[PDB]
Ligand binder design. Structure first.
Ligand SMILES: *[C@@H]1O[C@H](CO)[C@@H](O)[C@H](O)[C@H]1NC(C)=O
Ligand SMILES: *[C@@H]1O[C@H](CO)[C@@H](O)[C@H](O)[C@H]1NC(C)=O
Length: 267
């Protein structure tokens, strides 16, 4: 008869505006990995800061962010012109994944991109389009290189600034506000979430309800749905552990975000 929800007891607001609005985002070879934690994230009011997006949610559904808790949310905003907006996907690779921002083979999270045909085009370009071109090692997921190189591919090992046979990476784009359409820049803002892990920091809309510990409920502990009976526990949960699993995939024990009480779950 009850539908108690047990979202964590925080009331802070998330730094979304400090990331999406900005003035200058980043370069595509050196992105900023901003941490979002310990704040209520209302994902409904996002469509006003930068509309005409894609939202490309490889994982949690577009309308389901305001349903569950996230332990760590990381947003990486940079500029890639117009050709790798769909090549930022985990399957695709090339000169934008092996030598730039790389998404992992498995990945939960969504990306946001909108056009910059006049706002971030500038006269003769803003010249902050530094892409690593090529290097010796294909980049690991979520890895950047703050470095220059004199890449050669190997003949008469050279470290000089000369272009021929001592090729210099870190080129850039840049133009007058009009060009052949395809080069017009785009502001890509990714959103990488993570689940399980530590006690959750980012939750969303809070609808916390009191506890009844000897009857059946439709409980909701940090976004997970379950039907069963809650009760006190005599287990030996270590302070870092969060959930209590059994022989199968279900959870028979859980720790509430407040009052830190281990609670057994039985149907
Ligand atoms: C970005 O900040 C400016 C003030 O510097 C404000 O006028 C503008 O509305 C903001 N854009 C948003 C919140 O999308
Ligand atoms: C959140 O919940 C309790 C009761 O509403 C509140 O008094 C307290 O500030 C929070 N819990 C903890 C453990 O801080």
């Amino acid at each position: 008869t009850e539908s108690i929800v047990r979202f964590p007891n925080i009331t802070n607001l998330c730094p979304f505006d400090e990331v999406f609005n900005a003035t200058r985002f980043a370069s595509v070879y050196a992105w900023n990995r901003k941490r979002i934690s310990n704040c209520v994230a209302d994902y409904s009011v996002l469509y006003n800061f930068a509309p005409f997006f894609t939202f490309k949610c490889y994982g949690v559904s577009p309308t389901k962010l305001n349903d569950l808790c996230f332990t760590n949310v990381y947003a990486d905003s940079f500029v890639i012109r117009g050709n790798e907006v769909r090549q930022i996907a985990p399957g695709q690779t090339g000169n934008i994944a092996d030598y730039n921002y790389k998404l992992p083979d498995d990945f939960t999270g969504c990306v946001i991109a909108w056009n910059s045909n006049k706002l971030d085009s500038k006269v003769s370009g803003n010249y902050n389009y530094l892409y690593r071109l090529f290097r010796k090692s294909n980049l690991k997921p979520f890895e950047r290189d703050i470095s220059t190189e004199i890449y050669q591919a190997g003949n008469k090992p050279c470290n000089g600034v000369a272009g021929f046979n001592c090729y210099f990476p870190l080129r850039s784009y840049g133009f007058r506000p009009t060009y052949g359409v395809g080069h017009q820049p785009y502001r890509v803002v990714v959103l990488s979430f993570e689940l399980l892990h530590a006690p959750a920091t980012v939750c969303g809309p809070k609808k916390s309800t009191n506890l009844v510990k000897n009857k059946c409920v439709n409980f909701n502990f940090n976004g997970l749905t379950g039907t069963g009976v809650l009760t006190e526990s005599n287990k030996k949960f270590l302070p870092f552990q969060q959930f209590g699993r059994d022989i199968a995939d279900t959870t028979d024990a859980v720790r509430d975000p407040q009052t830190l009480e281990i609670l057994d779950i039985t149907p």
